[PDB]
Amino acid sequence: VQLVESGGGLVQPGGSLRLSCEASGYTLANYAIGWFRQAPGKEREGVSCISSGGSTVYSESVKDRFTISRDNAKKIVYLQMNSLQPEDTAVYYCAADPFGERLCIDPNTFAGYLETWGQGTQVTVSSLEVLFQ
Amino acid sequence: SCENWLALENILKKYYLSAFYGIEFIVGMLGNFTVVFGYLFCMKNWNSSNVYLFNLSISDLAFLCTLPMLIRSYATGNWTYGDVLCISNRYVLHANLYTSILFLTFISIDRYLLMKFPFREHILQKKEFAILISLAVWVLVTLEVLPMLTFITSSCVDYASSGNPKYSLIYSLCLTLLGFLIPLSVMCFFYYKMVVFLKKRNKPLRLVVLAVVIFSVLFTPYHIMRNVRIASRLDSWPQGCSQKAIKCLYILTRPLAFLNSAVNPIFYFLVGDHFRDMLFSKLRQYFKSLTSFRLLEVLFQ
Ligand SMILES: CCCCCCCC/C=C/CCCCCCCC(=O)OC[C@H](O)CO
Ligand SMILES: CCCCCCCC/C=C/CCCCCCCC(=O)OC[C@H](O)CO
Ligand SMILES: CCCCCCCC/C=C/CCCCCCCC(=O)OC[C@H](O)CO
Ligand SMILES: CCCCCCCC/C=C\CCCCCCCC(=O)OC[C@H](O)CO
Ligand SMILES: C[C@H](O)CC[C@@H](C)O
């Protein structure tokens, strides 16, 4: 499986973005999908994960703000990001675990076992108020 | 009058202890080298459970490496390894029993914390914290086992046979409480909390249920008999074959408690990582490296 991320760009503090994780040639049915982010100079941080069984997990930093989901046919994985703040500025990546019930138990450890990742998508949370200060 | 219990006690040491320790040695050595080499070859990023499990395996290997000496001394009825190795072997045997149940206590707390915080955001969920805790388990257990040194006064006898029984019974009873019963109830406590979390919303419960079962079943007969054995050595204890019978019952329970070091590598396959699948895959990669020539594949293609 080959992954590719969509969505993401500039958003104002308080704004929303919907990221997409597609597997261009096949279904993400038998896979667990994880959303990870990395800010400059900082360590890769797990944000959200979805199991093959549809179970969802969220980090303490994005809970009650983010929602991970699979589409109707379950081909794509979405990451709805609401009430975005400057601290959410990072390159967002998705990863796929072929053991669908494994990844979301321990996403930050089990990500180290995964070979399938996307190229990443830049998410930038900034206001014109900060830019012109 | 008690010659039957005496003949039985000799037979139990000569044939039962040496055969049961011999099986534990094979199973334990193979299982622990498999998972140890499995971690050193497959695991590149360790979490808290990985650190404790690895530590649990070092504790087991430390004890299992002494078994060939015990097996020979029992089979021949004579300790030829001297005083120092007798002391150091008695220490690693008890350090294994007590660090084992503590390592499992800490894995159970890790599994509970991971259930609530899967992204390991809390300080107690970090591998650097696991390393410090692991070191503290080694320091605490060493200090719990150290008072046994005072009981050595008067070949290589079991701790329950040497020293003043009045003081030894108190120490044994405190060591049963601090080393076995308190870590066991702590696991039971964490078992209950996991259930409450799940009922409010089965795979993470496996490890804790199994650890409570394995330790309850393996350590209870040994710990009852060790305390009964020491109590039976008191002047106030009744006369007769009771003392000799208790000696025999206590001997039966010892390899049952030490089965821990051969069966506890099973916890490596209960942490949700698909370690077994990683073991076969890596083994297949070493088998496929024989036929495939990657040094020629890159050069020509
Ligand atoms: C003589 C063999 C020693 C046996 C010692 C008893 C403890 C079991 C672990 C052994 C490690 C070596 C076996 C590695 C192969 C995979 C083991 C396995 O799959 O068993 C765990 C099971 O998955 C749980 O649900
Ligand atoms: C990599 C896999 C390795 C697998 C192989 C097993 C691991 C090594 C330990 C074996 C048990 C030790 C047995 C040696 C017992 C010697 C005891 C001793 O120290 O010597 C006594 C003294 O010389 C007399 O007075
Ligand atoms: C729960 C499982 C734990 C495992 C074991 C729990 C047993 C508890 C206590 C046993 C004391 C042993 C009783 C003492 C032996 C018999 C008493 C007696 O009068 O001995 C005379 C002798 O047997 C003439 O042949
Ligand atoms: C005979 C008595 C034995 C005494 C033994 C006391 C040791 C306990 C202290 C610390 C943990 C030791 C093991 C530390 C594991 C090192 C590997 C690690 O944690 O690094 C992970 C990394 O990401 C790549 O594997
Ligand atoms: C499914 C199981 O609990 C994971 C660990 C084994 C496969 O090694």
DSSP string, chain B: --HHHHHHHHHIIIIIIHHHHHHHHHHHHHHHHHHHHHHHHT-SS--HHHHHHHHHHHHHHHHHTTHHHHHHHHHHT---SHHHHHHHHHHHHHHHHHHHHHHHHHHHHHHHHHHH-TT--SGGGSHHHHHHHHHHHHHHHHHHHGGGGGT-------GGGSS-HHHHHHHHHHHHIIIIIHHHHHHHHHHHHHHHHHHT--TTHHHHHHHHHHHHHHHHHHHHHHHHHHHTTSTTSPPSTHHHHHHHHHHHHHHHHTTHHHHGGGGGGSSSS-HHHHHHHHHHHHHHHHH--HHHHHHH-
Indicate the Cα dihedral angle B109, B112, B115, B116, nearest 10°.
-90
* Number of other CB atoms surrounding residue A14 within 10 Å: 11
**Of the candidates B59, B64, B54, B101, the residue with the CA atom closest to the CA atom of residue B255:** B64
Q: Considering only CB atoms, which chain A residues are within 8 Å of B119?
A: 45-46, 57, 59-60, 107-108
Angle (nearest 5°) at CA B131 between B125 and B133: 75
Q: Are strands A10-11 and A32-38 parallel, antiparallel or unpaired?
A: unpaired
Match 């051969």 to its residue by tokens.
B262
CA atoms within 13 A on the CB side of A49: 29
Record: contact A106-B117, CB cut-off 8 A: no
Q: Report the SS3 class of residue A47.
A: strand
Q: Considering only CB atoms, which chain B residues are within 8 Å of A108?
A: 47, 119-120
**Of the candidates A97, A110, A126, A103, the residue with the CA atom closest to the CA atom of residue A11:** A126
Q: What separation in angstroms does the CA of A100 have from each of B47, B141, B205?
A: 20, 40, 19
Indicate the Cα dihedral angle B36, B141, B21, B181, nearest 10°.
-110
* Residue B68 to residue B63: CA distance in whole angstroms: 10
Match 């008890």 to its residue by tokens.
B94
* Residue B165 to residue B91: CA distance in whole angstroms: 19
Ligand 1 neighbours, Cβ below 6 Å, are B 27, 30-31, 34-35, 262-263, 265-266, 269, 276, 279
* Residue A121 to residue A6: CA distance in whole angstroms: 7
A28 touches A75 (CB < 8 A): yes
Q: Is the dihedral of CA A56, A58, A64, A65 positive or negative?
A: negative
B65 Cβ inside 6 Å of ligand 4 = no
* Residue B25 to residue B27: CA distance in whole angstroms: 6
Record: contact A102-B272, CB cut-off 8 A: yes
Is B203 buried (19+), middle (13-18) or exposed (0-12) by CB count in 10 A? exposed
From the CA atom positions of chain B, what is the Rg in Å?
A: 22
* Residue B18 to residue B254: CA distance in whole angstroms: 12
Record: contact B114-A57, CB cut-off 8 A: no
Record: contact B114-A105, CB cut-off 8 A: yes
A93 touches A39 (CB < 8 A): no
Query: Which one-letter DSSP state was computed for residue A117?
Result: E
**Burial track B65-92 (b if 16+ CB lie within 10 A, e otherwise):** ebbebbbebbbeeebebeeeebeebbbb
**Of the candidates A41, A19, A46, the residue with the CA atom closest to the CA atom of residue A122:** A19
Tokens of B240: 């007769």
* Residue B96 to residue A52: CA distance in whole angstroms: 40
Angle (nearest 5°) at CA B289 between B283 and B293: 170
Nearest listed ligand to the Cα of residue B145 = 4
Nearest listed ligand to the Cα of residue B93 = 4
* Residue A105 to residue B118: CA distance in whole angstroms: 6
B100 touches B179 (CB < 8 A): no
CB–CB contacts below 8 A, A to B: 46
Contacts of A11 (CB under 8 A, 6+ apart): A17, A84, A123, A124, A125
User: Which of B206, B276, B279, B284, when mutated, tests ligand 1's pocket best, judged by the most ligand atoms within 8 Å of its CB?
Assistant: B276
Kindly give the distance from the C-alpha atom of residue B25 to the centroid of ligand 2, in angstroms, as a whole number. 12
Contacts of A32 (CB under 8 A, 6+ apart): A49, A50, A51, A52, A96, A97, A99, A100, A101, A102, A103, A104
**Burial track B132-147 (b if 16+ CB lie within 10 A, e otherwise):** ebbeebbeebeebbee
* Number of other CB atoms surrounding residue B24 within 10 Å: 21
Please tell me what resolution, in angstroms, this structure has. 2.1
CA atoms within 13 A on the CB side of B259: 18
B39 touches B64 (CB < 8 A): no
* Residue B12 to residue A22: CA distance in whole angstroms: 66
A10: left (phi over 0), alpha (psi -120 to 50) or beta: beta
Tokens of B260: 């821990």
Q: B272 touching A, CB under 8 A?
A: yes
Q: A105 touching B, CB under 8 A?
A: yes
Of A45, A60, A106, the CB nearest to B272: A106
Residue identifier of the C-alpha nearest atom 21 of ligand 2: B81
Comparing alpha-carbon positions, the chain B residue that sits nearest to A55 is B201
Q: Considering only CB atoms, which chain B residues are within 8 Å of A104?
A: 118
A31 touches A97 (CB < 8 A): yes
A64 touches A55 (CB < 8 A): no
A80 touches A73 (CB < 8 A): no
B129 touches B116 (CB < 8 A): no
Determine phi and psi for B169, rounding to 5 degrees: -65, -45
Match 């390159």 to its residue by tokens.
A91
Q: Are strands A121-125 and A10-11 parallel, antiparallel or unpaired?
A: parallel
A119 touches A6 (CB < 8 A): no
Q: B58 touching A, CB under 8 A?
A: no
From the CA atom positions of chain A, what is the Rg in Å?
A: 14
* Number of other CB atoms surrounding residue B56 within 10 Å: 28
B124 touches B108 (CB < 8 A): no
Domains of chain B, by residue range, sit at 1-301
Determine phi and psi for A81, rounding to 5 degrees: -120, 105
